[PDB]
Design a protein around this nucleic acid. Structure first.
Ligand code: ZN
Ligand code: ZN
Lengths: 73, 183, 928, 182
RNA sequence: CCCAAUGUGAUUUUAAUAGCUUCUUAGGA
RNA sequence: UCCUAAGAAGCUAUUAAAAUCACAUU
């Protein structure tokens, strides 16, 4: 069921970015919102997985905002 | 508590009409049964009101305590849920950027989708460089990228011919690589 | 052979270079629009014209031009009459040149009239093309736009180049007709003065004026004593009215000497009273209208004079400067310190209005006077900063703060325990017929002002007033069922007091604070001020956080407590009477449960003959609604106040709606903006004013269907007489014919049976009449909305059904099934399965993601899911059993956690009834 | 009272149930006991009614005593707002327009245009900046205005040297420009 | 920051209505 | 002594209203 799992992961990923105070940077929040809303409207999984790689790269660029080496165990 | 009086009264009343005892005695028994039943119902109404009141208090304590437990832990729950869902998708591009990020190989930009777009990535050590850079090329997010410049931590430019095992102690790590999407 | 001798006589004395436009001696045949009323036919319709020969000019370099000589055959007695009338008006510069001659055909002399240098099309062809619009039949509109240089012939290759919403440049291409239409309005006032001074009597009709503005037909005029002539103009002006604002005709009145090559007039900035300018504009273009015009509606005689005079004010208010309208303020002294306060209002529709209870000196303020002076925008806007906001075309008043505010919307919360349960039951597999389509969409800081700028679709719109004043009396027949009137503050009902009070009152408390602080004598004393004074008020715009299938932002308008508290005391007795009624046209207050959906559908089917069903859509409905139709809706709701209010109290109440919910200031991000029109969601009357608008547009479509049908081809003598009387009741009677208003309502209620709820409707209609043209169809709504609502209605969002055993395709987002329930069949509603699964997966608060706290939530969603169990698709029938199986799991987990926490079981075992179908089936069986 | 009559009648009946052997006197004791008990239960029921009605009256009085507080509290906040806004009006600039009016009355929309000391301009893109504000002074509303500050959509200060065709992708649009009347 | 109206589900309190028991009083035998 | 007619007290059920809360339509 990978299309519904990608759309459900999009909602959880933007909820994590919002709690990390990304709304405090208007030019960054406006890109995260557009990647999220596109993944929800997508119809082919090969589009939705490319936009998921851009949206996740926001969270990985915020060095020290998540303990990724502990979350990834 | 008045049940004992109710139980003994109904047994004595049914025994009296079964044996055919005198009607004034059967009336004394029936009338005793009516007040004993009324005392049993009056006791039962008290316990049923106290049990109703305790069931509400126990329920409201459960809702109050568990609602506060949901609300207080939300940040740790969301991050744990996210890094659980990314394992079930099992996409190679998502796995490739997460497995690089464990080791400190992270992007400075949002990763671009269009051809010939700019990307910048941190390289912590030669032992990481060797797994992702190959000649003029760089491999990240399960795609091929072409390198256009590299810098020391002091912003001094470094040529791709300088980055080798024997020379690696002389470079000022972490390096920053700039690359473009190939197509 | 002979036709060259005719062609040379048609040229005559004049310098001309004519070419034949058909066969030379016989007449040409053309299809053209006519405004007609005889002893045997009446309407505004297309007919074949067959009496005329035609010739077209070449120029001096061999190219054809827009100049025709039109020649026709006469009976000799009509030829002598039309020559006798022409020689009296011959000196007028608004009259087309004529030549009268006799010529030989078939061996005999025949009389001819030639009419010189006419255009291809008439003023009736331009009016009939912009009314009655079809995007696949534009050929007359395209040729008029190209002939008069409005656009190149390449313009029509755009996708939807006519859609006012998708191609808003069409408002520039149509406004290039404006000065051509204004020169035609001026030539008509010259022709009326010529008829009067010459002593001539007759009717002016649009089919006798060319697109250069010249008048050319006199065969039905009569003589009278000189200086006592009478031009009749009642259809000419009224039928043309909606084209005057569409083509922006009076735009030249804004320039010096009214010359489009000179600069704009610079008005005195302090000026608010334009009463002498409005009276001068009326005498220039509408001199012979023959009904009294009041520039200020506070002078009008009744509701029908208010609708008449306001229609000229929406036209003339386009000339005056935008800063001149809105609240009028004065300096007053309270305890010796100077306040600025509103003491009147200037309206684009109602004119200038002044308050009757102004005090210039006061020693103290009551609690009632503190509400009025805190709600009034005067003290807020006079003490704020100047604002120039380049993000919008809407007018900006002031910034109330030193910073701008940007409001985001965050994503929904994910209920993972329900999604993992549904996936284990095999939901969401790829290629399934049930999938997720409803989500919470996030929004960035630009969203609030980006949604506000959609008020750019509200445009000044002038109605056909002779049509509108008939339609209002047939719309009022739908509201004869009910009762209404004023009530005291002790009789008012409030649903929820812990909701916002609007601006500024939300600084200090919820609506509960004001209903507790105001005694009933403070509340009854505020209502009595609004019958003698105008309170203008501020409204907040807030973004909405709720689930949807579409990603555009949604906003809600929070109306102030002064407006909310007093509108509720004027209207609530009627609104409670509309909601309590059953079997009516307006179905507000009726439930779908306990057999109510079946009773609604059995009522709309009525006793209609040859029945089909249809339903239709309103594009941009809340933004695009005209002010002339939102004023008409509140004048219909006020017709219940005939005993408790005078004519003066009813005017000052209307002014209070127009100052508070129609044209008012808007708080959006810490700044004040001027709203042009359209409905505000917090207006207590919104669902009821929408229902009056929805009936008005459906009555209008049936008048246009019947009046534009060719009356010679109607086979039934009853419907010929109905068409002939309808034309008189619009364009020739001037009082209400009550017996015809009852007869047209009785016709309409049989052949066109409606069920209405706010902006949503179903109709059951006679399909034999609708295909003959005797009642409305989906093309008549497309034509009306195009010129009336100024929006293009795509047929892709309309529907129709041929089989009544299927029911309506959609009403209130729910589909229908005919199903067996006991011994007999009933209609049941069902939702979209993706809306019911979406509400299980996605939630607006974090504590909604533990189901043991929330079992009441899943019982409510299973009541809406139940009808899906009777549907032929098993993937829809499984959605109800998913909800019942999850409710059992939640009670088993709740029972386990309660025992682990307290070592003692719950005593309420009665939760067992909620995982069995019998509790839910009882919601859809009659007799409760 | 009726209770003491009930308690003394209970003892008078109970001593005869215990040792008394005459039902005759028991029937007289029973009737007088049931009368006294009936009067006691009637007095207790009337007492209980008046007590429950007194708690309703006291809670109604507390609801009124708390509602007159909130009326007086909000009245002080409304007067504090209205009498503060009188300090922001430059009365010399407002007197000039109101004395020039024919009848002492003016449109509200002209008051910020003709009297405000300060302007905020909200700008969506660099083409709109260049067409309206380029330089350090500009003309709007038939007055001359001088720029004191610029800030971005994050409320960070922007220096005028940063706003150009080349650098415009690096700014958080819209910009807000604040100016004073020259 | 968080509008308006309508409908439905659940829990709690209060009023009325019926039966059920006892007490008191009165008529008839 | 029985039958009966009325009032009070208690018990039980039902209906209505109010408060609180969930969901749905526009
Ligand atoms: Zn009038
Ligand atoms: Zn009234």
């Amino acid at each position: 069921s990978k299309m519904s799992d990608v759309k459900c992961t999009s909602v959880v990923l933007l909820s994590v970015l919002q709690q990390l105070r990304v709304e405090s940077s208007s030019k960054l929040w406006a890109q995260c919102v557009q990647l999220h809303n596109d993944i929800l409207l997508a119809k082919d999984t090969t589009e939705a997985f490319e936009k998921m790689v851009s949206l996740l790269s926001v969270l990985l660029s915020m060095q020290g905002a998540v303990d990724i080496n502990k979350l990834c165990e | 508590p008045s049940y004992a009086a109710f139980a003994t009264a109904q047994e004595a009343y049914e025994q009296a009409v079964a044996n055919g005892d005198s009607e004034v005695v059967l009336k004394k028994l029936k009338k005793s049964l009516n007040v004993a039943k009324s005392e049993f119902d009056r006791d039962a109404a008290m316990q049923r009101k106290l049990e109703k009141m305790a069931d509400q208090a126990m329920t409201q304590m459960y809702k109050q305590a568990r609602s506060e437990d949901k609300r207080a832990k939300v940040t740790s729950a969301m991050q744990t849920m996210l890094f659980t869902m990314l394992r079930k998708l099992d996409n190679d591009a998502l796995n490739n950027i997460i497995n690089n990020a464990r080791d400190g190989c992270v992007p400075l930009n949002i990763i671009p989708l269009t051809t010939a777009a700019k990307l910048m990535v941190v390289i912590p050590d030669y032992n990481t460089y060797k797994n992702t850079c190959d000649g003029t090329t760089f491999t990240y997010a399960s795609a091929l990228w072409e390198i256009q410049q590299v810098v020391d931590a002091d912003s001094k430019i470094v040529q791709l011919s300088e980055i080798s095992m024997d020379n690696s102690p002389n470079l000022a790590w972490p390096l920053i690589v700039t690359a473009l999407r190939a197509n | 052979a002979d036709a060259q001798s005719f062609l040379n006589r048609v040229c005559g004395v004049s310098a001309a270079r004519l070419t034949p436009c058909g066969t030379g001696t016989s007449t040409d045949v053309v299809y053209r629009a006519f405004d007609i009323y005889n002893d045997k036919v009446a309407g505004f319709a297309k007919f074949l014209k067959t009496n005329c020969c035609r010739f077209q000019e070449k120029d001096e370099d061999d190219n054809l031009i827009d100049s025709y000589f039109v020649v026709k055959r006469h009976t000799f007695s009509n030829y002598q009459h039309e020559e006798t009338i022409y020689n009296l008006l011959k000196d007028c510069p608004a009259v087309a040149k004529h030549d009268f001659f006799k010529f030989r055909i078939d061996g005999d002399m025949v009389p001819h009239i030639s009419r010189q240098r006419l255009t291809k099309y008439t003023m009736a062809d331009l009016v009939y093309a912009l009314r009655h619009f079809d995007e696949g039949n534009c050929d007359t509109l395209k040729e008029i736009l190209v002939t008069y240089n409005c656009c190149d012939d390449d313009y029509f290759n755009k996708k939807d180049w006519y859609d006012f919403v998708e191609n808003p440049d069409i408002l520039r291409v149509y406004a290039n007709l404006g000065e051509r239409v204004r020169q035609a309005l001026l030539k008509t006032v010259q022709f009326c003065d010529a008829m009067r001074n010459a002593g001539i009597v007759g009717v002016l009709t649009l089919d006798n004026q060319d697109l250069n503005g010249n008048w050319y037909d006199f065969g039905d005029f009569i003589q009278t004593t000189p200086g006592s002539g009478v031009p009749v103009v009642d259809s000419y002006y009224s039928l043309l009215m909606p084209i005057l604002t569409l083509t922006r005709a009076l735009t030249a009145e804004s320039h010096v000497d009214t010359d489009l090559t000179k600069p704009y007039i610079k008005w005195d900035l302090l000026k608010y009273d334009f009463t002498e300018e409005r009276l001068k504009l009326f005498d220039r273009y509408f001199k012979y209208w023959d009904q009294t015009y009041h520039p200020n509606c506070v002078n009008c005689l009744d509701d029908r004079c208010i609708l008449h005079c306001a229609n000229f004010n929406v036209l003339f208010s386009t000339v005056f400067p935008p800063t001149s309208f809105g609240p009028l303020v004065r300096k007053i002294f309270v305890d010796g310190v100077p306040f600025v306060v509103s003491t009147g209002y200037h309206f684009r529709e109602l004119g200038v209005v002044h308050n009757q209870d102004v005090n210039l000196h006061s020693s103290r303020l009551s609690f009632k006077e503190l509400l009025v002076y805190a709600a009034d925008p005067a003290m807020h806007a006079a003490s704020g900063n100047l604002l120039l906001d380049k993000r919008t075309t809407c007018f900006s008043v002031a910034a109330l703060t030193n910073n701008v505010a940007f409001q985001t919307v965050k994503p929904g919360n994910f209920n993972k325990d329900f999604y993992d349960f549904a996936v284990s039951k095999g939901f969401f597999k790829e290629g399934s017929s049930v999938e997720l389509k409803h989500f919470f969409f996030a929004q960035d800081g630009n969203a609030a002002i980006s949604d506000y700028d959609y008020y750019r679709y509200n445009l000044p719109t002038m109605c056909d007033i002779r049509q509108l004043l008939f339609v209002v009396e047939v719309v009022d027949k739908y509201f004869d069922c009910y009762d209404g009137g004023c009530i005291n503050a002790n009789q008012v009902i409030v649903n929820n007091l812990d909701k916002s009070a609007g601006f500024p009152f939300n600084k200090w408390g919820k609506a509960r604070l004001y209903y507790d602080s105001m005694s009933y004598e403070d509340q009854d004393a505020l209502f009595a001020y609004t019958k003698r004074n105008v309170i203008p008020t501020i409204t907040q715009m807030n973004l909405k956080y709720a689930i949807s299938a579409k990603n555009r932002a949604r906003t809600v308008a929070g109306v102030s407590i002064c407006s909310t508290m007093t509108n509720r005391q004027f209207h609530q007795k009627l609104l409670k009477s509309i909601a309590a009624t059953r079997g009516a046209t307006v179905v507000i207050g009726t439930s779908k449960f306990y057999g109510g959906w079946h009773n609604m559908l059995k009522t709309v089917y009525s006793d209609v003959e040859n029945p089909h069903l249809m339903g239709w859509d309103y594009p941009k409905c809340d933004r695009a609604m005209p002010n002339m139709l939102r004023i008409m809706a509140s004048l219909v709701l006020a017709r219940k106040h005939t005993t408790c209010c005078s004519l003066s109290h009813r005017f000052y109440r209307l002014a209070n709606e127009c100052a508070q919910v129609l044209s008012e200031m808007v708080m959006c991000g810490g700044s004040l903006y001027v709203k042009p029109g359209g409905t505000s969601s917090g207006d207590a009357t919104t669902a009821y004013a929408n229902s009056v608008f929805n009936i008005c547009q459906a009555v209008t479509a049936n008048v246009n269907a019947l009046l534009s049908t060719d009356g010679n081809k109607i086979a039934d003598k009853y419907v010929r007489n109905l068409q002939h009387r309808l034309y008189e009741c619009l364009y020739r009677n001037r009082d209400v014919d009550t017996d015809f208003v009852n007869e047209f309502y009785a016709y309409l209620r049989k052949h066109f049976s409606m069920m209405i709820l706010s902006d949503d409707a179903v109709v059951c209609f006679n399909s034999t009449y609708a295909s003959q043209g005797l009642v409305a169809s989906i093309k008549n709504f497309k034509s009306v909305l195009y010129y009336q609502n100024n929006v293009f209605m795509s047929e892709a969002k309309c529907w129709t059904e041929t089989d009544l055993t299927k029911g309506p395709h959609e009403f209130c987002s729910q589909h229908t099934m005919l199903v067996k329930q006991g011994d007999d069949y009933v209609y049941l509603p069902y939702p979209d399965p993706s809306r019911i699964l979406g509400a299980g997966c996605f939630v607006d608060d974090i504590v909604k993601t533990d189901g043991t706290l929330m079992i009441e939530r899943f019982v409510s969603l299973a009541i809406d899911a139940y009808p899906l169990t009777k549907h032929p698709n098993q993937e829809y029938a499984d959605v109800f059993h998913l909800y019942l199986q999850y409710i059992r799991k939640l009670h088993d987990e709740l029972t386990g956690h309660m025992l682990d926490m307290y070592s003692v079981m719950l005593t309420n075992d009665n939760t067992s009834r909620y995982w069995e179908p019998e509790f839910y089936e009882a919601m859809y069986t009659p007799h409760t």
